[PDB]
Design a protein around this ligand. Structure first.
Ligand SMILES: [Mg+2]
Ligand SMILES: [Mg+2]
Ligand SMILES: [Mg+2]
Ligand SMILES: [Zn+2]
Ligand SMILES: [Zn+2]
Lengths: 744, 171, 108, 346, 180, 112, 79, 71, 83
RNA sequence: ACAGAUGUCCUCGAGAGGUA
C-alpha cells in the first residue's frame, strides 16, 4: 500500500467501499456463463473508461508466473482480465478502451530516465543470472541453452510505435467484435478503441473524451462514469472533471501488500491439497471503490473559510486544491526539496492557503489560468513558512539517524544552504547562482502553467520541456511579478520520434535495421546522448529505485535530422505506420443509430470518402463525429483472427460495424460549471463527519482503533439520480411543508 | 408442471407499525418479498393468488425486543426446474459455449459435451448459430430441451439441458 | 453484522458419538506435518497444526474458508488419519462390558 | 398540442419573424440559491418598454407568422379562435373568481371565416429581476464566465419576448394561442416541436399557515391552468419573503399537479374538473351562432363580449357604432397581408 | 419456510433417496398427499401449462378489480394478448417482478388451449386415468404424435401397454388443441 | 451537550446503523442532532433501579433492587433497617451493584 | 434479567447451525449470501442462533472429544 | 496544533486561584488541568488560565496562539 | 392445542404476568410505537405502561402453557388486576 | 505505466499473605 493511499484513507475513510464480484456457479465440472443483462448490485453504470496500459502491463512480465509461451499468453491474459473487468462493472451506454501513445515533450524527461533505469536493472540482473549459470556449470551440471537464452520479456520494448502495439491493437478489435457479437447484453454498448497511434498518455485521452462528451448541449448530467487504472493520481484527476457521478475502480492494494508471494518450489510438497488451495485463493482478487461524490462533500467541509470578500464556490474551491496537489507532486516536474514526503506537506499547504485567502481578493485559479500575484503571495508565504518545515525535517532525520552522493555533502541543516544546495548542481560562482535561480524560477513557472493547462484545458504546447534536474530550494520565485505566460501550439511527435525520444538502452531491439545500425555504430552523431554504463544513478534522499538520473538531455534538432535521414531508405510497409490515425468506434448490429449509420456511411450513396455524420446524445449516446474507416473492413466480409492458438471462432462483418471516430471540437473553453438539470445524489454525510473533518485529527491518534476495523460495515453507497427535484427543500412550503410535517 | 403449494413465511413486524393497518402492512411486505424470490428449495414465486383471503395469526412478541413475529399462511404458484423431464423453451442467447435456452423465468445452459456432434459453431449467418444438416437453431427459435443438471440450489437454482436423442429439436 | 438465515432458538440437544465418515466429511483440511509456523518462521506451514484454513489466527487476516475475521468465525475443524485404531479412554469400561456381553467370535 | 410557428418581439416593435432573438435558457445551481441573492437591486433603474408600446395586445407578429405559415403550407388550418394568451386565460378563470378581479374587453372579428379576438410594481420588478437572474440569454456551454459573473450585476428590461404559436383544441372545436415562452429547460431542436422541452418560471411568496397554503394552492391552480391551455410541461416557482430575497426555487412538472391538488381540500380538487367543464361549455357556446364567412369577400361583422353578473352578455352591434368603423373598415386588428392572402386564393 | 411437520427421522436420515430421476421417484417435499393448511391429506394438484395461464390470468383480473374498487372507494390474437398482458402487469403487481414478464410471454406464445371449455374438457378427459398429476401435466402441456415419443419424452408411463386408449386421448388432445 | 465529564451526561451515542460515537474523544462542543430511534448511553441518574447484592447470597433477600441516589462521597450508603436481611455491618464490608441495560429488565427489577 | 446478565452483559455470539447436522460446521459468507454444509450438501436449511462464547467453546471441546452435541430448533414430540 | 498541551499552567479566578498544574487533555474550549497538591482533575476554560514556563518564569495569558511558541 | 373457552386457570393477573406486560409495554412505548391513552404530561415509558394498564387498554394476549403442552389464550382486558 | 508501514487488550499455571 502506498503512502498516498494510507493518507487518503486516514483523512477520508468513507471513500473506501467494498465490491461485489460475482462468482459463476460450477456444477458437474462445467462453468455456468454469468449473465450480463441482470441488474448490477454495485449500482447502475453507463460509461466505463479503461486504461488499456494498466491491464496489458501487469499481465506481461508479472512477479509470480511469467508467460511461458509467446505473446499469445499475454494476449489471452489481458483478454480475460478485460472480460472480468467488464463483467464486474457492466457498462450499459458506452465502453471506452484507451492505451498510451504519443506524449508531449515534458513527459520524456522522466519517462526516459525510468526506462533507462529499468533497462539497466534488467541488464545487471541478466549479468548476475549469467554468472550464476557459469558458477553452476563449474560443478558439473548441464543446462540446456534454451533455459539460458530464456531472458525476460523486455518490458522496455513496450512503447508506442513498435509492432507489438500494432499486434495488440489488432487483437483488441477482434476481441471486442467477438464480445459484441456473442453477448446479447452488449446490444446498446458502444466500444471505442484509442490505439497507440493516437497521441495521449492514456489519461489525457480520457479527459479529452469526457470533455468532448460534455461538448454537447443534450448531454445528460446524471450519467455515471468509471475509470480503471493502477496510477495513484488517477483518483485525484477525476475530481477535476467536475462530475459528481464519478467513481474510480482499482484493485485492493491493502490486501495485495501482504498477499500470496510464496515460491513455486513449496507448491509440490503437499501435492494436490496445497496446490488446489493456492489456485482457489488466487482465483479471487478483492477490489475496492473510490467514489468521488462523497469526496466532494468532504472537500466542501474541509475547504470552508470564515470571512471572504468574494463568494465561496464549491466548483472553484476544488480548483485551488487540485492545482496545489499537482504542484506538490506530479509526473512532469522534479520534486520540490521542501515537499519530499508529499503527504505531511499537504496539511501545511492547506493551512497556508487558509491563512492567506483573506489577504487575497480573488480566487487561486480561473478555469486553469493561474493568478500570478496570488500564487506569488502563496509561494512567498510558503517560503516564509518553509524554514520551520525544513528545520523539523532536519531534526527528524537527525533523530532517525541517531551512485553519486550529492545531497549528503550539501548539509542543508547548517545555516547558509542557499548556495550550498546549488553547488551540488553547478559551480561555485556568485553571479551564476543568481542566473540559475532566475532560470529555474522561469522554467518552474512555465512548467506549472503548462501542466495546469494540460490537466484542465488540454495540451497547449506539445513540445515544452524541462531543461533542469534539480528543483529550486525554498524562498523561490522571489521576484517574478512581471512575466506573462503564453504557450505556443506545436505538432505532436511522430511515433519513431517519440520512440527515440524515450531513448531505450542498447538492450532494446524494437527499432528497425536502419535505426539500430545508426545507433550501435561507435561513430554516431547522437552517441553522446546514449550512455552505456549508465553511472548517472544518484540517491538524493529516499532509497532503492526512487533515485533519479543525471544523464544529459536530448536535442530535438539532432533527433529530427536523424529521423529525416533514416526515413527515405526505410521500407514503405514499415513507413505506413507513421500515420497519426483516429479512434475507431464499434457498434452492435441492433444499435439505435445503426440503421442511420448504415444508411448514411458505407451505403448506396457511394461518396468519395468525405461524408461525415454528427449525431447527438438524444438517441443512444456517445455524441461525436463518425468518418469512413481507413482499414480493410467492408460489408459482407470476414475478419481473420490474429490470436491463432486461441480457439476463437471466426466472425462475419455483418455483425459488427466499424468506423473511424473523431471527437467534436470544443466550441469555447471548457469551463467548470455544473450543468443544468443535474440531480444531486442521496444525502449520506452527517454533521458529525463534517466536524470530524473540520477539526485537525492526528491520524485519529489510535485512541479507539477507528482507522481500521469494520470497514465492510460501510456497505454500498447508492449512486445515480435520487428524486425528481434537484433542489433540497429549505423553508418554502407545499412539498417542503409536507416534508417538514412528516419529519417532525 | 407448475405447482400450487401452501408455503409459509415468517415476517418480524416492527412495533413502529403496530397500528390498525399492520395487517395490510404484512400483506404488502409479503407481496414485495415473496415475488421474484429465487428460493432454492422451491424455486420462483411467480404470483400469489387470493390476496383478500390470506390469513394471519397472533404474532408472538420476542423476548429480546418488542418486534412481533407473524407466521402467515399463503398459497402461490411455484416453478421448480426439477430433474428428469422434457420441456419446451425458446433460445435467447448463443455463443461457442452453447445456447441459452429460456423456459419461463429460467436460463438453462447446454455445454459442449451435452449436445450431439451434429452441431458446429459458426457466424456466417446474421445470427451466430450452430448450423449443420437438418438442424436449424437461431437466436429466436423453437427447441425441446431435456434437463439433467444438478440444479445446485444455493440461494438460487439453475439447470443444465441435453440435446441427445431425437425429438429434442425444433419440430 | 447481517445474516439472511432465519433466527431461531435451540429447542433440543441430541448427543451421540462421531462416526469416522462424518468427521472426515466435515473436516476442511488434513493435518500431517507435526510443525507450526514452519514456513521459515515467517508464515504458517500448510498441513501443519496451524493450517490457515482452520481459521484466523491473529491480526485481521480473514479466514480463507469463510472470508471473515474472528468476530464471526466459529473455528473450522480438521482431522487426523490415525494409522491404527486406538481405544477411547473414556469408553474403556463400556467397551470391556460390551465385549463381555457379546461373543468374541460371532456378532451374536 | 402542436406548434405551428414562432416570432420575436424585441424593441422598436418591428415584430420580426422566425427569429430566436433571446431564447432564454434556465440555469440556477443550488449554490446561488444558498448565496442569499437580493431581488431588490436597482428598482429605480428599471427600463419598461411597455409604456411606448402602441398596443398591449398587438398581434402584428402573430399575423405575420400566420401569413408565413400559410405561404409555406397549402390549405388553411381548421382552427378558428385566435388569442394572444390573454383572452383565453381570463375567460376560463373568470368563472372561478369574482368578476371584479378582471376587466373584460373583447373585440371578436370573423374575417375570412377565422376568428381574431383582441383585448404591485415592486412585486413585478422583483419577479422580472428573478427571471433575468435565472437565465443567461444564449445557452450555457457557449458563453464565457464573464457573462456568468456579470449576470448578478445586470440590468432589467421589459421586452424581447419569445412567442410561439401553439395549436390545440378539444373535440371538434380547435383553436391556436399566441403563447409567449420565456424559458427553455433542455436541448432545443431546430425544425422540430419544442413544446415538451419548454418551461415557465414565476415568483411567489412563502407559506406560514393554512391560509397561505390555500393561497399557494390558488396560485398553483392559476399557473397550471395557464400552462395546460398551452402545454407547458414544467412549472418553476421562486419563493420570496418580506425582504425580497429568493429563499428556495422548486420545479412543478405536469401529470402530478392534478393529483397534488386532488390529495388536498375538495375545493381545489374539483376546481380542475370545474375549469375543464367551463372551458368546454364556453367553447360550445362560442361555436354556436358566430357567422361563418366560408368563401372570402363575404359580409363581416364584429361582436362585443362582456362578462357581467356571471353571464357573458353578447350583443350584435350596428354599423353606426364608432368601434365598427375602426375595426371593419379601420383594420385596427387586421392588416394588408391578411386581406392580400384572402384575395390570393379567392 | 416449510409446510410439513418433521417425521420419519428427518434429522439424520443422511441420503434417504437420490434426487428425482426420469422414472418418477418424487422428492421428499413434493410427494403426493400434501398437508393441507386448514386440515390434512390434500392431494397434489394436476396443473398443466395451459391451465397455469388461465389461473394466473384469473388471479390477475381478480386482483385488478380488487385494487380498482379499493382506489375507487378511497377517491389480434397473440398481438392483442401481449398488449393486454402488458397493460395489466404495468400497475397490478407493481414493484419490479422482472421474471413475471418472461413467464407470461412463455404462457402466451405456448398456450396449447385458449378457452375455459377446452381445458375443462382436457382435464375431465385426463381424470379418468390414475396417472401421477406430473405425468398428465406434461402430457397436456407438450403435444405428442407417437406413443413411443410420449414414453421417451415423458418417462414413468410404462403402466400403459395397450396404447389404444392412449392413441384415442392423444387424438382427442390434438383435435382440442387444433380447435383453438 | 453536557458531555461525559459532568455527572449528568452521556458517554456514547449509538447510531441506527450500529456505529458508535465517542463524546469524549470527538468533543468539539458540536450540536449533534439526535434522530429518533438512536441510542444514547447516559449516566445513571436518580430514581434508577439497580441490583444490590452481597456475597454470600444465602437467600433471596441477599440481593434486592434499590433506587439510585447520587451522593458526593465515594462509599455506598444504605438504610440501617436494610442491613439485617443483607447480614452486613459497616466494619469494612463491600457489596456489589448491578445496573440493568434494558427497559424490560428495569421493569422486572422494579416490580419483583 | 438473568438472561440479559448472562448473555448481553458478558458475551454474545452468533453462529450458524446446519439443519441436518445439528452441529456448527457451517461455512457462512454473509457478503456472498452463501451458507453451505459440506457434510450433508445442505444450502437451504441453515439457521442462526445466539449462544454465549463459553457454550461455543464447550461444544467445540466436546466435538474434539468425539462427542456430537447436535442442536435442533424443533420438537420431536410430533414424530 | 493546540498550544495548551503539556505546558505548566496556573489556574486563575474561581476556587482554585493560584494553583499550579499541568494540562493533559484539551478538547473544544474546556481544558483538563491536573493539580499538584490535590489528586484530582478539574476542567476549566483554556482562556481563563494563564500560561507559565516549564522551568520557571513570567506568566502570560492565552496570547500564545499569536506567538505560536512557549514562555 | 387450545382449550376453547372452557379454560380453568385463574381469572386474575399474576405478579410475573404483570411484570412481563409492564416491561413489554414500557419497551414498546420507549421505541416509536403508538400509545392508546392520554399521556397527560407523563414522559416515562414505564409510567405510561401503568397508565395504559389502569383501565385495561393494552392489546396484549397471555398464553398460559399447560405442562402437557396445551395452551389457553387470556386477554389482558379480561384479566382481573387485584395486586 | 506503477510501488516503502501500521490495530486497542495481552501473560499463564502456580505459590504466599490477607479482607468480609
Ligand atoms: Mg501518470
Ligand atoms: Mg413568466
Ligand atoms: Mg463485618
Ligand atoms: Zn472462517
Ligand atoms: Zn450438516
Amino acid at each position: 500500500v502506498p503512502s498516498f493511499f494510507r493518507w487518503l484513507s486516514r483523512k477520508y475513510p468513507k471513500i473506501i467501499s467494498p465490491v461485489l464480484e460475482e462468482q459463476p456457479q460450477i456444477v458437474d465440472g462445467v462453468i455456468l456463463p454469468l449473465d450480463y443483462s441482470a441488474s448490477n448490485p454495485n449500482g447502475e453504470l453507463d460509461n466505463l473508461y479503461l486504461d488499456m496500459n494498466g491491464i496489458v502491463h501487469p499481465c506481461s512480465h508479472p512477479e509470480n508466473k511469467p508467460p511461458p509461451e509467446t505473446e499469445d499468453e499475454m494476449l489471452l491474459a489481458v483478454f480475460e482480465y478485460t472480460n472480468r473487468v467488464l463483467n464486474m462493472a457492466r457498462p450499459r451506454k458506452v465502453l471506452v478502451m484507451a492505451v498510451d501513445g504519443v506524449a508531449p515533450r515534458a513527459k520524456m524527461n522522466q519517462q526516459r530516465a525510468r526506462r533507462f533505469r529499468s533497462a539497466r536493472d534488467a541488464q545487471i540482473e541478466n549479468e548476475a543470472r549469467e554468472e550464476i549459470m557459469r558458477q553452476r556449470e563449474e560443478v558439473g551440471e548441464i543446462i540446456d541453452d534454451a533455459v539460458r537464452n530464456k531472458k525476460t520479456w523486455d518490458s522496455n520494448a513496450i512503447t508506442p510505435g513498435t509492432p507489438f502495439m500494432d499486434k495488440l491493437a489488432a487483437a483488441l478489435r477482434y476481441w471486442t467484435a467477438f464480445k459484441l457479437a456473442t453477448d446479447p447484453g452488449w446490444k446498446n454498448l458502444q466500444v471505442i478503441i484509442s490505439d497507440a497511434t493516437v497521441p495521449g498518455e492514456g489519461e489525457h485521452k480520457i479527459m479529452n473524451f469526457i470533455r468532448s462528451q460534455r461538448a454537447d448541449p443534450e448531454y445528460n448530467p446524471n450519467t455515471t462514469h468509471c475509470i480503471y487504472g493502477l496510477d495513484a493520481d488517477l483518483i485525484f484527476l477525476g475530481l477535476a472533471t467536475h462530475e459528481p457521478h464519478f467513481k474510480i475502480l482499482r484493485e485492493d492494494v491493502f490486501a495485495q501488500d501482504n498477499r500470496k508471494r510464496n515460491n513455486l518450489k513449496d507448491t509440490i510438497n503437499m501435492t494436490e491439497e496445497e496446490k488446489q488451495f493456492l489456485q482457489k485463493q488466487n482465483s479471487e482478487q478483492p477490489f475496492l471503490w473510490l467514489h468521488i461524490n462523497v469526496l466532494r462533500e468532504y472537500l466542501s467541509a474541509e475547504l470552508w473559510v470564515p470571512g471572504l470578500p468574494f463568494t465561496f464556490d464549491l466548483e472553484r474551491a476544488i480548483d485551488d486544491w487540485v492545482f496545489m496537489c499537482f504542484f506538490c507532486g506530479n509526473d512532469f516536474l522534479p520534486h520540490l526539496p521542501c515537499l519530499d514526503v508529499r503527504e505531511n506537506s499537504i496539511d501545511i499547504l492547506l493551512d497556508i492557503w487558509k491563512v492567506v485567502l483573506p489577504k487575497l481578493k480573488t480566487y487561486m485559479t480561473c478555469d486553469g489560468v493561474l493568478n500570478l500575484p496570488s500564487v506569488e503571495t502563496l509561494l512567498q508565504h510558503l517560503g516564509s513558512r518553509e524554514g520551520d518545515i525544513f528545520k523539523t525535517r532536519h531534526i527528524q532525520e537527525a533523530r532517525k539517524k541517531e551512485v553519486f552522493d550529492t545531497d549528503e555533502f550539501v548539509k542543508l541543516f547548517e545555516p547558509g544552504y542557499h548556495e550550498r544546495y546549488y553547488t551540488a548542481k553547478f559551480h561555485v560562482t556568485p553571479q551564476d547562482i543568481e542566473q540559475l535561480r532566475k532560470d529555474m524560477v522561469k522554467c518552474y513557472i512555465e512548467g506549472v502553467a503548462w501542466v495546469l493547462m494540460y490537466y484542465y484545458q488540454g495540451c497547449a504546447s506539445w513540445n515544452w520541456f524541462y531543461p533542469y534536474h534539480y528543483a529550486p530550494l525554498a524562498t523561490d520565485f522571489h521576484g517574478f511579478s512581471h512575466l506573462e505566460i503564453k504557450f505556443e501550439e506545436g505538432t505532436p511527435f511522430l511515433p519513431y520520434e517519440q520512440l527515440m525520444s524515450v531513448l531505450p538502452a542498447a538492450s532494446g531491439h524494437a527499432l528497425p535495421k536502419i535505426f539500430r545500425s545508426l545507433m550501435s555504430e561507435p561513430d554516431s552523431e547522437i552517441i553522446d546522448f546514449y550512455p552505456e554504463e549508465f553511472p548517472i544513478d544518484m540517491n538524493g534522499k529516499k532509497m532503492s529505485w526512487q533515485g533519479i538520473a543525471l544523464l544529459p538531455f536530448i536535442d530535438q534538432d539532432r533527433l529530427l535530422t536523424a529521423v529525416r535521414a533514416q526515413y527515405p531508405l526505410l521500407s514503405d510497409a514499415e513507413r505506413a505506420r507513421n500515420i497519426r490515425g483516429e479512434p475507431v468506434l464499434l457498434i452492435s448490429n441492433k444499435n439505435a443509430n445503426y440503421e442511420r449509420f448504415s444508411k448514411k456511411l458505407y451505403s448506396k450513396e457511394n461518396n468519395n470518402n468525405n461524408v461525415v455524420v454528427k449525431f447527438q446524445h438524444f438517441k443512444s449516446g456517445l455524441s461525436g463525429i463518425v468518418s469512413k474507416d481507413v482499414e480493410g473492413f467492408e460489408l459482407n466480409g470476414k475478419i481473420v483472427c490474429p490470436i491463432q492458438g486461441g480457439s476463437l471462432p471466426n466472425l462475419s462483418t455483418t455483425l459488427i460495424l466499424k468506423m473511424s471516430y473523431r471527437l467534436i471540437p470544443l466550441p469555447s473553453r471548457n469551463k467548470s460549471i455544473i450543468l443544468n438539470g443535474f440531480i444531486p445524489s442521496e444525502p449520506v454525510l452527517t454533521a458529525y463527519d463534517l466536524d470530524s473533518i473540520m477539526y485537525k485529527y492526528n491520524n485519529q491518534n489510535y485512541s479507539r482503533r477507528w482507522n481500521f476495523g469494520n470497514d465492510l460495515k460501510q456497505n454500498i453507497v447508492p449512486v445515480g439520480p435520487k428524486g425528481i427535484t434537484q433542489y433540497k427543500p429549505r423553508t418554502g412550503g407545499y412539498r417542503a411543508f409536507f416534508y417538514f410535517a412528516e419529519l417532525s | 408442471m407448475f405447482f400450487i403449494k401452501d408455503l409459509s413465511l415468517n415476517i418480524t413486524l416492527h412495533p413502529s407499525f403496530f397500528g390498525p393497518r399492520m395487517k395490510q402492512y404484512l400483506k404488502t411486505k409479503l407481496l414485495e418479498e415473496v415475488e421474484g424470490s429465487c428460493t432454492g428449495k422451491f424455486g420462483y414465486i411467480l404470483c400469489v393468488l387470493d390476496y383478500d383471503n390470506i390469513d394471519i395469526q397472533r404474532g408472538r412478541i420476542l423476548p429480546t425486543d418488542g418486534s412481533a413475529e407473524f407466521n402467515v399462511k399463503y398459497r402461490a404458484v411455484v416453478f421448480k426446474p426439477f430433474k428428469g423431464e422434457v420441456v419446451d423453451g425458446t433460445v435467447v442467447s448463443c455463443s461457442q459455449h452453447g445456447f441459452e435456452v429460456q423456459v419461463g423465468p429460467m436460463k438453462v445452459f447446454v455445454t459442449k459435451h451435452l449436445m450431439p456432434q451434429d452441431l458446429t459453431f459458426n457466424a456466417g449467418s446474421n445470427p451466430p448459430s450452430y448450423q449443420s444438416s437438418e438442424d436449424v437453431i437461431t437466436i429466436k427459435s423453437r427447441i425441446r430441451v431435456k434437463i439433467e443438471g444438478c440444479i445446485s440450489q444455493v440461494s438460487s437454482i439453475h439447470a443444465i439441458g441435453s440435446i441427445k436423442e431425437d425429438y429434442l429439436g425444433a419440430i | 453484522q447481517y445474516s439472511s438465515a432465519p433466527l431461531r432458538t435451540v429447542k433440543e440437544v441430541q448427543f451421540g458419538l462421531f462416526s469416522p465418515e462424518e468427521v472426515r466429511a466435515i473436516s476442511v483440511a488434513k493435518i500431517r506435518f507435526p510443525e507450526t509456523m514452519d514456513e521459515t518462521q515467517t508464515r504458517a506451514k500448510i498441513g501443519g497444526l496451524n493450517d490457515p484454513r482452520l481459521g484466523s489466527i491473529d491480526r485481521n487476516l480473514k479466514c480463507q474458508t469463510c472470508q471473515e475475521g474472528m468476530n464471526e468465525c466459529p473455528g473450522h475443524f480438521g482431522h487426523i488419519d490415525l494409522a491404527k485404531p486406538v481405544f477411547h479412554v473414556g469408553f474403556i469400561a463400556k467397551i470391556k462390558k460390551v465385549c463381555e456381553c457379546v461373543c468374541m467370535h460371532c456378532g451374536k | 398540442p402542436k406548434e405551428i410557428g414562432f416570432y420575436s418581439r424585441t424593441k422598436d416593435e418591428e415584430y420580426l419573424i422566425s427569429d430566436d432573438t433571446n431564447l432564454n435558457y434556465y440555469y440556477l445551481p443550488d449554490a446561488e440559491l444558498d448565496r442569499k441573492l437580493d431581488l431588490s437591486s436597482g428598482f429605480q433603474k428599471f427600463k419598461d418598454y411597455y409604456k411606448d408600446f402602441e398596443d398591449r395586445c398587438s398581434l402584428r407578429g402573430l399575423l405575420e407568422t400566420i401569413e408565413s405559415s400559410e405561404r409555406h403550407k397549402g390549405k388553411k388550418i381548421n382552427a378558428d379562435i385566435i388569442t394572444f394568451r390573454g383572452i383565453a386565460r381570463k375567460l376560463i378563470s373568470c368563472a372561478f373568481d369574482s368578476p371584479s378581479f378582471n376587466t373584460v374587453d373583447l373585440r371578436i372579428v370573423s374575417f375570412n371565416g377565422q376568428l381574431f379576438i383582441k383585448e404591485q410594481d415592486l412585486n413585478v420588478f422583483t419577479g422580472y429581476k428573478f427571471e433575468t437572474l435565472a437565465t443567461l440569454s444564449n445557452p450555457l456551454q457557449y458563453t464565457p464566465r464573464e457573462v456568468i459573473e456579470k449576470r448578478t450585476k445586470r440590468i432589467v428590461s421589459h421586452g424581447d419576448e419569445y412567442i410561439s404559436v401553439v395549436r390545440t383544441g378539444v373535440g371538434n372545436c380547435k383553436l391556436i394561442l399566441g403563447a409567449e415562452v420565456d424559458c427553455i429547460f433542455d436541448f432545443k431542436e431546430n425544425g422540430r416541436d419544442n413544446l415538451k422541452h419548454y418551461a415557465e418560471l414565476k415568483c411567489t411568496q412563502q407559506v406560514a399557515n393554512i391560509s397561505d397554503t390555500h393561497k399557494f394552492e390558488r396560485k398553483l391552480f392559476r399557473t397550471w391552468l395557464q400552462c395546460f391551455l398551452v402545454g407547458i410541461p414544467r412549472i418553476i416557482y421562486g419563493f420570496k419573503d418580506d425582504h425580497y430575497v429568493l429563499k428556495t426555487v422548486e420545479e412543478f412538472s405536469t401529470e402530478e399537479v392534478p393529483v397534488l391538488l386532488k390529495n388536498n381540500n375538495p375545493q381545489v380538487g374539483s376546481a380542475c374538473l370545474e375549469a375543464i367543464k367551463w372551458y368546454g361549455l364556453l367553447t360550445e357556446w362560442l361555436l354556436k351562432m358566430i357567422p361563418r364567412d366560408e368563401d372570402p369577400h363575404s359580409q363581416i361583422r364584429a361582436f362585443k363580449l362582456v362578462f357581467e353578473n356571471n353571464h357573458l352578455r353578447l350583443s350584435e352591434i350596428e354599423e353606426s357604432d364608432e368601434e365598427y368603423s375602426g375595426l371593419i373598415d379601420g383594420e385596427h386588428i387586421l392588416s394588408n397581408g391578411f386581406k392580400e392572402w384572402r384575395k390570393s386564393l379567392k | 419456510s416449510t409446510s410439513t411437520f418433521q417425521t420419519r427421522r428427518r434429522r439424520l436420515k443422511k441420503v434417504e433417496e437420490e434426487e428425482n430421476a426420469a422414472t418418477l421417484q418424487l422428492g421428499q417435499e413434493f410427494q403426493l398427499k400434501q398437508i393441507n393448511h386448514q386440515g390434512e391429506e390434500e392431494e397434489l394438484i394436476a396443473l398443466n401449462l395451459s391451465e397455469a395461464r388461465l389461473v394466473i390470468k384469473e388471479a390477475l383480473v381478480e386482483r385488478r378489480r380488487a385494487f380498482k374498487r379499493s382506489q375507487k372507494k378511497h377517491k389480434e390474437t397473440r398481438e392483442k394478448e401481449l398488449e393486454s398482458i402488458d397493460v395489466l402487469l404495468e400497475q397490478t403487481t407493481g414493484g419490479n417482478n422482472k421474471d413475471l414478464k418472461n413467464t407470461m410471454q412463455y404462457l402466451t406464445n405456448f398456450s396449447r388451449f385458449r378457452d375455459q371449455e377446452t381445458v375443462g374438457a382436457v382435464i375431465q378427459l385426463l381424470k379418468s386415468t390414475g396417472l401421477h398429476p406430473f405425468e398428465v401435466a406434461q402430457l397436456g402441456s407438450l403435444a405428442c404424435d407417437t406413443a413411443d415419443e410420449a414414453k421417451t419424452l415423458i418417462p414413468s408411463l410404462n403402466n400403459k401397454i395397450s396404447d389404444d386408449e392412449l392413441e384415442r386421448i392423444l387424438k382427442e388432445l390434438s383435435n382440442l388443441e387444433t380447435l383453438y | 451537550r453536557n458531555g461525559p465529564n459532568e455527572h449528568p451526561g452521556a458517554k456514547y451515542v449509538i447510531r441506527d446503523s450500529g456505529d458508535r460515537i465517542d463524546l469524549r474523544y470527538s468533543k468539539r462542543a458540536g450540536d449533534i442532532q439526535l434522530q429518533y430511534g438512536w441510542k444514547v448511553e447516559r449516566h445513571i441518574m436518580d430514581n434508577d433501579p439497580v441490583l444490590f447484592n452481597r456475597q454470600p447470597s444465602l437467600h433471596k433477600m441477599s440481593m434486592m433492587a434499590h433506587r439510585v441516589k447520587v451522593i458526593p462521597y465515594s462509599t455506598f450508603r444504605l438504610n440501617l433497617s436494610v442491613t439485617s436481611p443483607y447480614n452486613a455491618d459497616f466494619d469494612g464490608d463491600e457489596m456489589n451493584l448491578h445496573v440493568p441495560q434494558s427497559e424490560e429488565t428495569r421493569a422486572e427489577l422494579s416490580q419483583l | 434479567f438473568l438472561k440479559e446478565r448472562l448473555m448481553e452483559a458478558s458475551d454474545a455470539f452468533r453462529v450458524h447451525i446446519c439443519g441436518i447436522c445439528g452441529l456448527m460446521t457451517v461455512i457462512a459468507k454473509l457478503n456472498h449470501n452463501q451458507f453451505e454444509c459440506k457434510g450433508c450438501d445442505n444450502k437451504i436449511d441453515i439457521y442462526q442462533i445466539h449462544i454465549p462464547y463459553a457454550a461455543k467453546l464447550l461444544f467445540q471441546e466436546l466435538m474434539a472429544m468425539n462427542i456430537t452435541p447436535r442442536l435442533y430448533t424443533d420438537r420431536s414430540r410430533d414424530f | 496544533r493546540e498550544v495548551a498541551l503539556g505546558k505548566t499552567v496556573r489556574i486563575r479566578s474561581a476556587g482554585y486561584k493560584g494553583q499550579l498544574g499541568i494540562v493533559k487533555d484539551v478538547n473544544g474550549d474546556k481544558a483538563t488541568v491536573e493539580l499538584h497538591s490535590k489528586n484530582k482533575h478539574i476542567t476549566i476554560d483554556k482562556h481563563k488560565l494563564t500560561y507559565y514556563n516549564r522551568e520557571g518564569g513570567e506568566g502570560i495569558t492565552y496570547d500564545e496562539l499569536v506567538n505560536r511558541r512557549g514562555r | 392445542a387450545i382449550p376453547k373457552d372452557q379454560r380453568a386457570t385463574t381469572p386474575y393477573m399474576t405478579k410475573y404476568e404483570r411484570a412481563r406486560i409492564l416491561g413489554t409495554r414500557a419497551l414498546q412505548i420507549s421505541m416509536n410505537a403508538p400509545v392508546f391513552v392520554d399521556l397527560e404530561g407523563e414522559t416515562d415509558p414505564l409510567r405510561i405502561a401503568m397508565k395504559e394498564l389502569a383501565e385495561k387498554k393494552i392489546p396484549l394476549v397471555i398464553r398460559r402453557y399447560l405442562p402437557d403442552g396445551s395452551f389457553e389464550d387470556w386477554s389482558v382486558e379480561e384479566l382481573i388486576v387485584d395486586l
